[PDB]
Amino acid sequence: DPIPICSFCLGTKESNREKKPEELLSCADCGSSGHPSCLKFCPELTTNVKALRWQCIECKTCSACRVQGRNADNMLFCDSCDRGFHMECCDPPLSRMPKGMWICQVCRPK
Amino acid sequence: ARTKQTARKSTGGKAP
Ligand SMILES: [Zn+2]
Ligand SMILES: [Zn+2]
Ligand SMILES: [Zn+2]
Ligand SMILES: [Zn+2]
């Protein structure tokens, strides 16, 4: 199911954009993969994404309401775990996209 | 915040 090729640079785990080995992250729904460096993930994000069932940007469903929803423009991605949320499904709901870093309700401490 | 628009600009297009 996982495609052993990065969707952005077409390299395997043996050859990222700098021709160095780097493991692939793979979408659990469509199988598409990418190097974290090609996905522009930091190591923190990469390790946490390697704590869950990950979806690529095209398969991503809202973690609260469990659907992709109608508009692509109103989903934001957590800077800690890459989960997607509708603005309306945040806590509290967001009237406006924040600037800079944003962390989702799942990552925030109890 | 990171959105589909910002993410696609940061990664660039998928390789055809
Ligand atoms: Zn790559
Ligand atoms: Zn996918
Ligand atoms: Zn939602
Ligand atoms: Zn999160």
- What CATH number is given to the structural domain containing A59? 3.30.40.10
With CA atoms as reference, the chain B residue closest to A38 would be: B11
Question: At a CB cut-off of 8 Å and minimum separation 6, what does A33 contact?
Answer: A2, A3, A4, A5, A6, A7, A24, A25, A26, A27
Burial class of residue A86, CB neighbours in 10 A (0-12, 13-18, 19+): buried
Which residue range(s) make up the domain with A65?
A: 1-110
> What spacing in Å lies between the alpha carbon of A78 and ligand 4's midpoint?
5
The total number of structural domains that make up chain A: 1
Judge whether A81 is closer than 8 Å to chain B, CB to CB: no
In sequence order, the 6+-apart residues with CB closer than 8 A to the CB of A28 are A53, A54, A55, A59
* Reported resolution, Å: 1.6
Give the count of Cβ contacts less than 8 A between chain A and B: 41
**Is A66 in the B-facing interface, judged by CB distances under 8 Å?**
no
Q: How crowded is residue A33: how many other Cβ atoms within 10 Å of its Cβ?
A: 22
